[PDB]
Design a protein around this motif. Structure first.
Motif, PDB file in Angstrom:
ATOM      1  N   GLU A  10       0.848  -1.183   0.000  1.00 11.91           N
ATOM      2  CA  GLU A  10       0.000   0.000   0.000  1.00 11.91           C
ATOM      3  C   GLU A  10       0.885   1.235   0.000  1.00 11.91           C
ATOM      4  O   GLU A  10       1.758   1.374   0.861  1.00 11.91           O
ATOM      5  N   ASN A  11       0.661   2.124  -0.962  1.00 16.41           N
ATOM      6  CA  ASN A  11       1.398   3.375  -1.059  1.00 16.41           C
ATOM      7  C   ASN A  11       0.409   4.511  -1.247  1.00 16.41           C
ATOM      8  O   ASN A  11      -0.514   4.405  -2.058  1.00 16.41           O
ATOM      9  N   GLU A  12       0.599   5.592  -0.496  1.00 15.72           N
ATOM     10  CA  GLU A  12      -0.309   6.727  -0.502  1.00 15.72           C
ATOM     11  C   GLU A  12       0.492   8.019  -0.467  1.00 15.72           C
ATOM     12  O   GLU A  12       1.459   8.138   0.290  1.00 15.72           O
ATOM     13  N   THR A  13       0.088   8.987  -1.288  1.00 18.30           N
ATOM     14  CA  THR A  13       0.788  10.259  -1.399  1.00 18.30           C
ATOM     15  C   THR A  13      -0.217  11.396  -1.496  1.00 18.30           C
ATOM     16  O   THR A  13      -1.307  11.229  -2.048  1.00 18.30           O
ATOM     17  N   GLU A  14       0.156  12.548  -0.947  1.00 20.23           N
ATOM     18  CA  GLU A  14      -0.646  13.757  -1.035  1.00 20.23           C
ATOM     19  C   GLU A  14       0.277  14.963  -1.130  1.00 20.23           C
ATOM     20  O   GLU A  14       1.297  15.027  -0.440  1.00 20.23           O
ATOM     21  N   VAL A  15      -0.083  15.912  -1.989  1.00 17.49           N
ATOM     22  CA  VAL A  15       0.645  17.164  -2.145  1.00 17.49           C
ATOM     23  C   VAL A  15      -0.362  18.302  -2.204  1.00 17.49           C
ATOM     24  O   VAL A  15      -1.348  18.223  -2.941  1.00 17.49           O
ATOM     25  N   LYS A  16      -0.118  19.350  -1.425  1.00 20.26           N
ATOM     26  CA  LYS A  16      -0.933  20.554  -1.437  1.00 20.26           C
ATOM     27  C   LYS A  16      -0.041  21.762  -1.669  1.00 20.26           C
ATOM     28  O   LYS A  16       1.151  21.739  -1.359  1.00 20.26           O
ATOM     29  N   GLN A  17      -0.630  22.818  -2.219  1.00 24.12           N
ATOM     30  CA  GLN A  17       0.102  24.057  -2.473  1.00 24.12           C
ATOM     31  C   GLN A  17      -0.908  25.183  -2.633  1.00 24.12           C
ATOM     32  O   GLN A  17      -1.636  25.220  -3.628  1.00 24.12           O
ATOM     33  N   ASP A  18      -0.944  26.098  -1.669  1.00 21.90           N
ATOM     34  CA  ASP A  18      -1.852  27.238  -1.685  1.00 21.90           C
ATOM     35  C   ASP A  18      -1.046  28.525  -1.748  1.00 21.90           C
ATOM     36  O   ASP A  18      -0.106  28.713  -0.969  1.00 21.90           O
ATOM     37  N   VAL A  19      -1.417  29.404  -2.671  1.00 19.10           N
ATOM     38  CA  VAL A  19      -0.771  30.696  -2.850  1.00 19.10           C
ATOM     39  C   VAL A  19      -1.838  31.774  -2.768  1.00 19.10           C
ATOM     40  O   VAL A  19      -2.964  31.582  -3.236  1.00 19.10           O
ATOM     41  N   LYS A  20      -1.486  32.902  -2.165  1.00 22.37           N
ATOM     42  CA  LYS A  20      -2.414  34.002  -1.964  1.00 22.37           C
ATOM     43  C   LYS A  20      -1.659  35.314  -2.095  1.00 22.37           C
ATOM     44  O   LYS A  20      -0.461  35.387  -1.819  1.00 22.37           O
ATOM     45  N   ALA A  21      -2.372  36.350  -2.526  1.00 16.96           N
ATOM     46  CA  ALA A  21      -1.786  37.669  -2.695  1.00 16.96           C
ATOM     47  C   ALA A  21      -2.858  38.721  -2.463  1.00 16.96           C
ATOM     48  O   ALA A  21      -4.056  38.429  -2.469  1.00 16.96           O
ATOM     49  N   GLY A  22      -2.413  39.951  -2.244  1.00 17.56           N
ATOM     50  CA  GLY A  22      -3.331  41.054  -2.046  1.00 17.56           C
ATOM     51  C   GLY A  22      -2.630  42.376  -2.227  1.00 17.56           C
ATOM     52  O   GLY A  22      -1.426  42.498  -1.980  1.00 17.56           O
ATOM     53  N   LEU A  23      -3.388  43.376  -2.667  1.00 18.86           N
ATOM     54  CA  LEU A  23      -2.868  44.723  -2.851  1.00 18.86           C
ATOM     55  C   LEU A  23      -3.985  45.715  -2.581  1.00 18.86           C
ATOM     56  O   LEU A  23      -5.128  45.488  -2.984  1.00 18.86           O
ATOM     57  N   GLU A  24      -3.655  46.807  -1.898  1.00 17.55           N
ATOM     58  CA  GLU A  24      -4.650  47.790  -1.499  1.00 17.55           C
ATOM     59  C   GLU A  24      -3.967  49.134  -1.291  1.00 17.55           C
ATOM     60  O   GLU A  24      -2.800  49.196  -0.898  1.00 17.55           O
ATOM     61  N   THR A  43      -4.090  20.601  -5.271  1.00 18.00           N
ATOM     62  CA  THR A  43      -3.968  19.385  -4.479  1.00 18.00           C
ATOM     63  C   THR A  43      -3.856  18.183  -5.403  1.00 18.00           C
ATOM     64  O   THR A  43      -4.527  18.121  -6.437  1.00 18.00           O
ATOM     65  N   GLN A  44      -3.005  17.233  -5.028  1.00 16.99           N
ATOM     66  CA  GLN A  44      -2.816  15.999  -5.776  1.00 16.99           C
ATOM     67  C   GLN A  44      -2.733  14.831  -4.807  1.00 16.99           C
ATOM     68  O   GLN A  44      -2.085  14.925  -3.762  1.00 16.99           O
ATOM     69  N   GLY A  45      -3.384  13.730  -5.165  1.00 19.55           N
ATOM     70  CA  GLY A  45      -3.408  12.549  -4.327  1.00 19.55           C
ATOM     71  C   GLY A  45      -3.183  11.281  -5.120  1.00 19.55           C
ATOM     72  O   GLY A  45      -3.503  11.223  -6.310  1.00 19.55           O
ATOM     73  N   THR A  46      -2.622  10.259  -4.479  1.00 17.49           N
ATOM     74  CA  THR A  46      -2.360   8.984  -5.131  1.00 17.49           C
ATOM     75  C   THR A  46      -2.469   7.864  -4.110  1.00 17.49           C
ATOM     76  O   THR A  46      -1.914   7.966  -3.015  1.00 17.49           O
ATOM     77  N   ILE A  47      -3.192   6.805  -4.469  1.00 19.77           N
ATOM     78  CA  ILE A  47      -3.250   5.575  -3.686  1.00 19.77           C
ATOM     79  C   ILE A  47      -2.968   4.419  -4.630  1.00 19.77           C
ATOM     80  O   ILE A  47      -3.683   4.239  -5.622  1.00 19.77           O
ATOM     81  N   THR A  48      -1.936   3.641  -4.327  1.00 18.50           N
ATOM     82  CA  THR A  48      -1.578   2.461  -5.102  1.00 18.50           C
ATOM     83  C   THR A  48      -1.566   1.266  -4.162  1.00 18.50           C
ATOM     84  O   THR A  48      -0.868   1.281  -3.143  1.00 18.50           O
ATOM     85  N   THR A  49      -2.333   0.237  -4.503  1.00 21.31           N
ATOM     86  CA  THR A  49      -2.446  -0.963  -3.688  1.00 21.31           C
ATOM     87  C   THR A  49      -2.238  -2.187  -4.565  1.00 21.31           C
ATOM     88  O   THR A  49      -2.807  -2.287  -5.655  1.00 21.31           O
ATOM     89  N   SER A  50      -1.414  -3.111  -4.085  1.00 17.77           N
ATOM     90  CA  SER A  50      -1.111  -4.344  -4.793  1.00 17.77           C
ATOM     91  C   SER A  50      -1.137  -5.493  -3.802  1.00 17.77           C
ATOM     92  O   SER A  50      -0.674  -5.350  -2.667  1.00 17.77           O
ATOM     93  N   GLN A  51      -1.682  -6.629  -4.227  1.00 13.11           N
ATOM     94  CA  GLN A  51      -1.840  -7.782  -3.354  1.00 13.11           C
ATOM     95  C   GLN A  51      -1.695  -9.062  -4.163  1.00 13.11           C
ATOM     96  O   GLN A  51      -2.218  -9.162  -5.275  1.00 13.11           O
ATOM     97  N   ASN A  52      -0.983 -10.036  -3.600  1.00 15.66           N
ATOM     98  CA  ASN A  52      -0.760 -11.328  -4.233  1.00 15.66           C
ATOM     99  C   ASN A  52      -0.943 -12.437  -3.209  1.00 15.66           C
ATOM    100  O   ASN A  52      -0.533 -12.297  -2.054  1.00 15.66           O
ATOM    101  N   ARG A  53      -1.556 -13.537  -3.636  1.00 18.52           N
ATOM    102  CA  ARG A  53      -1.681 -14.737  -2.821  1.00 18.52           C
ATOM    103  C   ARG A  53      -1.423 -15.958  -3.690  1.00 18.52           C
ATOM    104  O   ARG A  53      -1.907 -16.036  -4.822  1.00 18.52           O
ATOM    105  N   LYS A  54      -0.648 -16.902  -3.166  1.00 21.94           N
ATOM    106  CA  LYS A  54      -0.427 -18.187  -3.813  1.00 21.94           C
ATOM    107  C   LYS A  54      -0.646 -19.298  -2.800  1.00 21.94           C
ATOM    108  O   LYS A  54      -0.082 -19.259  -1.704  1.00 21.94           O
TER     109      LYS A  54
END
Lengths: 471, 135, 463, 135, 135, 135
Positions: A194-208, A225-236
């Motif tokens: 099981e592999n899980e990833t998340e990335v966020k990035q917020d930018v803000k500006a103002g002028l007055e 925002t970016q997200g990823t879930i990768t799951t792999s499973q094997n049984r023998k």
């Protein structure tokens, strides 16, 4: 509660035991594995020598292993900025975050059950024992051996013997254990990632800002925002049941198979503790001749010559003197200054038969050393010089079938690795049977090139070579 | 400078000899084994023959901490067939540029080469073993 | 607890075993596959040679693999602008957002089970063994062989032999294993896909002045959900031996494995040619007449104009005689092999030789007309499908050829040529066929590798 | 900096396995071959088994602007004999100092060891080969 | 200028001669292998015979800092049947326009042509391999 | 910008398969054929197997106004023998610099490789056809 004694004392049950177990038939040692012969090799005896053993055993082993590994990481970065003046203001922000999780799981389970229900051991008497009850060879087998040894030329005798032993088998079971054995084996393997990833990035500006009432404002905002879930499973899962003896129709029902172990009609050979060569059952004058004819190689001792050059090595290198006689072969370079061994095959090439000798070819890349033409064969020395595939002395250098050779022991010479050469010697054994030749074969440990082949570590069996056969 | 140094390890792995010819260091110098101050002229290495078990080592480096790189070329030739060109090898350890150049040239289906240990990325070129097989 | 011995010592049971297993009949290795012959090839024996083997085995293997990959993304953008004076104020807002999700999941399952319940091995004695219990051919088969060999012309003899071996068979099972085997196999595959997307957008604006006011507004949104999944399940049961009516009850089938009336041949470890059962002078003649191709060594000449290549290229010299064909360009400087079919073309019989047609496009190489056939050499020149020597050039049935080995010549790719060699083992002619490595142009046919079997060509024969 | 690099080759000429342990780099980082940006942890080699005629290459190089050179120690041990210490090798390619040090220690009559191809006067250590043989 | 070039490899994958005719370059110049400074004429290409499985290379490049692109035309003909025009190929890598043109024109069914390598959109026109095949 | 571009055509004329690995592009971006705007990720070619008589085309170019040119490296590895390395190719068509580099490295005498069409004098690298033939 019947035993082997009750079976043996009844001709019908005794003969059923003999027949259902191929106790009068030898075993053929083909390259694909042992198979019983369909020809009866010995005469049916009037009785059998047996002992009783009813000590049953059930043994069950279970092993489970699990492993889990969870990794977690996270980061956050933040920046905030402001500028000011009596007429204008400005502002910015930057917030970033990253997250990561990883889980790896491994499981393994195996169960092994063995149900061993013996009945006893049945023994046959070999001629060397000298006792009066002795297995008589069937007249057909004796006649076949006589006809084989009656052929005009040695190769005809050898081919006749090969056919005879392919039909009748090469070994005979003189001690066998009667009973029933049931085996089960389960193997289960499991993996999960099981592999899980998340990335966020917020930018803000103002002028007055404003002057004389002419005010104004502005704003801006970007996020991501970016997200990823990768799951792999094997049984023998693998399950195998094997039954040998008892009621085979009860293989999948252990309790009923165990209940069926006392029924004579299902008793089978569950192990062999003595095996006798079919040639060892012959009368001695025929026995020696058959043994001699079955040897794959002839042998001859020849004069040797030091190979000039090689002045830097600690031990002199010797090779066959003169040309190898037609049809013969040589086996490698040796430190033996007295003699070297020449060999010649006894059996021609035929379909379905592995030859005793293999040809050697110049290496594919970065190596002047010979390579075996057939996969598992071996040769006893390294080559001190350039291996000529097509010209003497390289054209007649040969390798050996793996059954001809046994591992030897090295004997190093030279002070430094650049000149470290081994003098292979036989491994001594108490039995004067698996004895090998003290050819004193040379193996240089450090071959200058690359991709060189495995360093020779073998000596030739004495039991495979026939001397003075006048052939 | 001594920071620019190179070792040519020509290692015959066939059974037929090879000969060094045209070996000249345009830049830097050629020194003895280990020590860089004991500079040695190229005359000691020009025309020498390498035997199957023998190794010949060239030790070239720049001028003494004078910020001078070391560069040169040489050819391996076949004394058997009258010194026909086997391979042309060029090395360069320039003070100005940290990158290094090891180029091998020539053509023979009647001879094979393998080399290892070269470092062109940064720093000294490094000791490089060139195994020669007269296939 | 009966074994093959109890079956064989009883004439009724022994003959039932022989009859139900077609042990007196050969196998017609036809174009489609092996099928047993309806005719009895050998005389019924008074007894059978056998060994007993009851080491039953059950093996089951299950494998599951699954995978899931989920991706998500989202964005937003926002802006606002405002202006004012002591008499007016105007502002406008803007916001948008997008969202995207995607899940792909795959599953696989695999169950294979094999129930093997042996009984023993039954052997037949072939003439080459030299024993006295040798099998005896049926008088009808021997009479048929004699009649085939008695025909006036060799082609008549060959056609008679073909019909005889189509009736009686081409192979005879000499060692067979008796018992029961049951197999179950399950394959399941599953894939799902889910996708979701959302987008929305907004704007606002207004005004004030002097006294006054206003308003406006605008919503806007979009949404999508896309889902897909597939599932495939396949189950196959095979029963060979035992009570075949119990195929779906593994427990009632393993119970019937002791009933001799259901024992069957579960594998063959020795098969012998039907020709190899005949007496020697007839065996040799039959195996000679069965060869698909006649052979003839001819002289070779060099195709000049190929200077830029390591080796000289040679082709059959002179014109190919009436009815013969050649098999490609070779490097051998002395001889080339001509061939000729022995059997006329007839419905339902794959010819020995396929004609070659000039290639589709951007290649000047020939192609095999019949699909699976092979030809041995690259063509060094412009292949003429209409004029000699191309008119008389042929490929071979896939059974005529075995993979060779390459001996590369040349210092450069645009010069290099392979000379294909027999792989010294099924001997194959060392014809020295040439195979350029870098063919000019594109769309070329696959490079030849194979070499011609020696067993397929009949030299001499006065034909 | 990357201008100080070392490549070490353990070449198992002998007939018996050799285990590598205690691979620690006091200065610098262990990277892959041909790409100095591919750092590899010491766990990738700790306890690794090298078979006959198998080459074990470990490439160390001072990180960019490290100014610490490349230094460390590693141990060759016998897989048999209870991980007995075959040889203790210490290498040092200092950034500040021109002189380098490659030294061998450890007592085993069981194994013969040869090593060559290392620079001790100036610049980087170079590419080093160590021949392991189980007398 | 030199930022615009074209390499044209007329490759005779057939078995008959193709003759190059009426080679004329208007913009730029014809140079020679590798060196864009060695201006070469058309007399060394006009009227030549390109044998089967033989390559003929035309390298053209804009003049050195001329703010001028490359442009020319050549005609392949069939020597056997009276120099009948097989095809007419026009190339252009203008300095002014980012677009680049390679036009294969004319028509002769007796001949089959194919080309690859051309880069028309941006930058230099690239190198073009033209496989010709009488069929 | 797009004025710097490279097209590599790996042509597996040989009889055995070849694989591509370590396809990393430091400068520039990989794009589909005939449309530089069609960016294609490096994963589209990672681990690709080029079977006999098959051409694999990889195109790289620098994004418009990047002023970055296009640079990268990749390796050819024989699938057999544990992905043994065949060759190491490095390409560079820098924007600021008026020279392009196309370098081939690695020593594998079992594979025979040739290439042509590379243009280094000025502008983009060009279209390069690399022939690969394992022996």
């Amino acid at each position: 509660g019947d035993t082997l004694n009750d079976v043996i004392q009844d001709p019908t049950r005794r003969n059923k035991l003999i027949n259902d177990n191929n106790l009068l038939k030898g075993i053929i040692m083909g390259r694909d594995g042992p198979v019983p012969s369909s020809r009866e090799l010995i005469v049916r005896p009037d009785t059998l020598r047996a002992i009783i053993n009813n000590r049953a055993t059930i043994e069950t082993t279970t092993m489970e292993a699990e492993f889990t590994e969870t990794l977690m990481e996270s980061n956050y970065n933040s920046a905030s900025v402001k500028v000011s003046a009596p007429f204008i203001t400005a502002n910015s922000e930057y917030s970033e975050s990253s997250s990561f999780k990883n889980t790896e799981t491994e499981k393994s389970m195996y169960t092994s059950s063995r149900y061993l229900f013996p009945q006893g051991r049945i023994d046959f008497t070999t001629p060397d024992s000298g006792f009066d009850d002795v297995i008589k060879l069937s007249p057909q087998f004796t006649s076949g051996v006589q006809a084989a040894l009656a052929k005009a030329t040695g190769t005809e005798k050898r081919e006749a013997l090969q056919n005879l032993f392919q039909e009748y088998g090469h070994v005979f079971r003189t001690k066998v254990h009667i009973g029933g054995v049931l085996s089960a084996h389960t193997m289960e393997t499991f993996s999960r990632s099981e592999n899980e990833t998340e990335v966020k990035q917020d930018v803000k500006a103002g002028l007055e800002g404003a002057v004389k009432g002419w005010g104004g404002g502005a704003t801006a905002g970007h996020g991501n925002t970016q997200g990823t879930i990768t799951t792999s499973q094997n049984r023998k899962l693998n399950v195998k049941y094997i039954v040998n003896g008892g009621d085979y129709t009860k293989i999948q029902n252990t309790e009923e198979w165990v209940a069926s172990t006392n029924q004579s009609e299902h008793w089978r050979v569950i192990e062999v503790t003595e095996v006798t060569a079919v040639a060892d059952l012959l009368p001695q004058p025929i026995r020696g001749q058959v043994k001699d004819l079955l040897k794959p190689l002839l042998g001859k001792w020849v004069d040797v010559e030091k190979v000039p050059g090689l002045e830097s090595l600690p031990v002199s290198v010797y090779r066959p003197k003169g040309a190898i006689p037609a049809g013969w072969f040589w086996l490698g370079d040796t430190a033996d200054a007295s003699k070297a061994l020449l060999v010649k095959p006894t059996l021609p090439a035929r379909s379905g038969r592995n030859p005793a000798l293999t040809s050697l070819h110049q290496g594919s890349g970065m190596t002047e050393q010979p390579f075996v033409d057939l996969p598992q064969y071996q040769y006893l020395s390294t080559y001190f010089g350039s291996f000529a595939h097509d010209t003497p002395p390289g054209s007649t250098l040969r390798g050996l079938r793996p059954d001809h050779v046994l591992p030897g022991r090295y004997e190093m010479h030279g002070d430094t690795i650049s000149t470290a050469v081994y003098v292979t010697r036989p491994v001594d054994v108490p039995f004067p049977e698996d004895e090998c030749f003290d050819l004193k074969s040379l193996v240089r440990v450090k071959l200058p090139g690359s991709g060189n082949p495995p360093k020779p570590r073998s000596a030739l069996k004495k039991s495979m070579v026939l001397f003075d056969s006048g052939e | 400078a001594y920071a620019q140094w190179v070792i040519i390890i020509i290692h015959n792995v066939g059974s037929q000899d090879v000969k060094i010819k045209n070996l000249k260091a345009s830049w830097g110098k050629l020194h003895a084994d280990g020590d860089k101050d004991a500079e040695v002229s190229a005359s000691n290495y020009e025309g020498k023959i390498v035997k199957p078990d023998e190794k010949l080592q060239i030790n070239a480096s720049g001028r003494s901490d004078a910020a001078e790189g070391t560069t040169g070329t040489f050819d391996l030739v076949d004394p058997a067939d009258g010194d026909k060109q086997v391979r042309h090898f060029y090395w360069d350890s320039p003070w100005g540029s940290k990158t290094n150049t090891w180029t091998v040239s020539g053509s023979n289906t009647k001879w094979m080469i393998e080399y290892s240990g070269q470092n062109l990325d940064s720093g000294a070129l490094g000791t490089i073993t060139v195994d020669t097989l007269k296939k």
